Amino acid sequence: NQYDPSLLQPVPRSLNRNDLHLSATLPFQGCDIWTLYELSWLNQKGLPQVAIGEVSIPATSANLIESKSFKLYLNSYNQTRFASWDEVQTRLVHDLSACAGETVTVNVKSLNEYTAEPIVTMQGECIDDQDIEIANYEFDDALLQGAAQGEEVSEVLHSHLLKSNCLITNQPDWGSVEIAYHGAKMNREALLRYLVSFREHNEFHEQCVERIFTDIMRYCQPQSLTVYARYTRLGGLDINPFRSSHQSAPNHNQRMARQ
Amino acid sequence: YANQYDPSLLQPVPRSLNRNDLHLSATLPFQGCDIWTLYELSWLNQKGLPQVAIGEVSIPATSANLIESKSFKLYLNSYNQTRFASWDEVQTRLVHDLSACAGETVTVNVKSLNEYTAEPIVTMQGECIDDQDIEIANYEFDDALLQGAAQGEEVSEVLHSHLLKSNCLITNQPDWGSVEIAYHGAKMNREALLRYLVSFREHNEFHEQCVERIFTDIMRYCQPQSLTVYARYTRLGGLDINPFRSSHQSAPNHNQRMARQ
Ligand SMILES: *C(N)c1c[nH]c2nc(N)[nH]c(=O)c12
Ligand SMILES: *[C@@H](N)c1c[nH]c2nc(N)[nH]c(=O)c12
């Protein structure tokens, strides 16, 4: 029951990126922001410690980290004595960086750092309140065909209706997604239908955001695009992939209502 | 095809099974409720467009049964591809089905996500007992850690800890919780109390069960005049449970989430 870095399992980003027909020179920059709600270990005297971990994995890393393996790796801390909070931080940076293949950022935060922090919603216009009929739940990226026919705009849209089925467990993925762009104005009905069409599609959170980014790019051809999704946790860990034309990281990391 | 609405997925567990092991009678030493938060509630409207909400449920501690958590999650997943005419219908079905499973009327609120904007993450009341310079090496459950724990002057105190952990009975993963203990009685030794709470760490529990054991152990070893034990656990499978048990109080004032929830 002791600390065991061998439990981490990398998954290469190249599998789905090749399925999206991306080259190794990526159309986006960004990162996967993870929240570790259940981080716990023993101090040097055996007294339990609890914290929330905030992790950022660069989107250029060769691998993402499979979430269940990440949970089991964290559970291996639970019965292990560490000298200090700094030692825990150091071990997390080392093991997560080795797994992902690029340096990962890790903040280990005491629970009192969250007291009185507010829940946030996303920015700009919510596209969800449309009186439309959904006839089927098949994924269809052609729902975006001709979706960006309007005048040149810069705007931020979001939806709370993103759902997909997790590839390896068949359990539901729940997310909110924010889309900021400069380009021909997007048809809201087409964008909503496209997102709803993920509902029974097998996905990982990271690849779903990459698919949304690359489908919007190809069908809607904005000049600038940022897609940031915030998913509910699975097994005590959540993932918030951020992909952008121009931005390396989001300027905010705050929890939403279902997270 | 996803399974659609299926109330037969709900699994009742009689509260009396474990209460028997606590040597309780049918006449309970406590009152209270189990407050559940349903972070993943989603269904389709009559046109097939997804709806999302957060549910809040209160189950009376006098109900014959509690509801097994995995079954509750699967029952809620059965809504995900089911069409409902209104939010009111969803709320009404949740009340009906969860009341039938528990054996007593339960309260349900189905809230739009916008109701949560600017809502706080909260801590618990009173003094945190966790920052102690003590050594622990034996994690096995021991209620006798509370022997002689309340010797002090008569006081009213509120104490809390974030260090509650146990192992989830059926599904066998760790349970993470914070627990608030309010009492009036001889002052409790904080080292004994913390060692006792940490002794749950490798013990198989339901959350509801662990709070009732904490309540009944503090009553028998410390004999306060009045006591409330309230724990807030992190979610499993999108739902969390927050059992409240008290000699004199009915329910907590709100259902605000804590940092890990
Ligand atoms: C399901 N959505 C799932 C299961 N394991 C996962 N790992 C990662 N990194 N992302 C996911 O979305 C995962
Ligand atoms: C594990 N802690 C577990 C598994 N099923 C559960 N059901 C309920 N009602 N409480 C629990 O703590 C449960």
| Domain extents in chain B | 1-118, 123-261
CA distance A176 to A122: 8
Evaluate: CB of B207 within 6 angstroms of ligand 2. Answer: yes
In chain A, DSSP assigns E strands to: 10-12, 29-42, 48-58, 63-65, 105-109, 125-126, 148-166, 172-186, 202-203, 224-231, 237-244
Instruction: Tell me, in Å, the resolution of the deposited structure.
Output: 1.4
**Per-residue exposure over B32-52, b if at least 16 CB sit within 10 Å of its own CB, e if not:** bbbbbbbbbbbbbbeeebbbb
Strand bridging mode A237-244 / A224-231: antiparallel
User: For residue B19, what is the DSSP state?
Assistant: H
Angle at A12 between CA A222 and CA A103, to 5 degrees: 85
Method: X-ray
Strand segments, DSSP code E, in A187-223 are 202-203
Cα R_g (chain B), whole angstroms: 19
Q: Are A194 and A140 in contact (CB under 8 A)?
A: yes
The set of protein residues with a Cβ atom below 6 angstroms from ligand 1 is A 64-68, 166-168, 173, 204-206, 239
Residue type, A76: S
> Closest-lying ligand to the alpha carbon of A11?
1
Q: How many residues does chain B have?
A: 261
Is A173 catalytic? The answer is yes
Residue holding tokens 């600390």? A3
CATH class of B1-118: alpha beta
Enter the CATH code of domain A121-259. Answer: 3.30.1130.10
Q: How far apart are CA A194 and CA A211, in angstroms?
A: 11
Span between the terminal Cα atoms of chain A, in Å: 29
Q: Report how far residue B252's alpha carbon sits from residue B258's, in angstroms, rounded to the nearest whole number.
A: 14
Instruction: Identify which of A7, A31, A67 to mutate to test ligand 1's pocket (most ligand atoms within 8 A of the CB).
Output: A67
Q: What share of chain A is helix, strand, coil (3-state, %, to 5)?
A: 25, 35, 35
Strand spans (E) along B169-225 = 174-188, 204-205
* CATH code matching the domain that covers A1-116, chosen among 3.40.50.150, 3.40.50.720, 3.30.1130.10, 3.40.50.1000: 3.30.1130.10
Tell the CATH topology of B123-261: GTP Cyclohydrolase I, domain 2 (3.30.1130)
Residues in B closer than 8 angstroms to A46, CB to CB, are 135-137
A206's enclosing H/E stretch is: helix A205-220
Q: How far, in Å, CA of B256 to CA of B33, rounded?
A: 15
The rounded distance, in Å, linking the Cα atoms of B175 and B234 is: 7
CB contacts, 8 Å: B50 with chain A = 161, 163, 196, 199
| Integer Cα distance of B210 and B203 in angstroms | 10
Name the closest residue on chain A to residue B47, using Cα atoms: A133
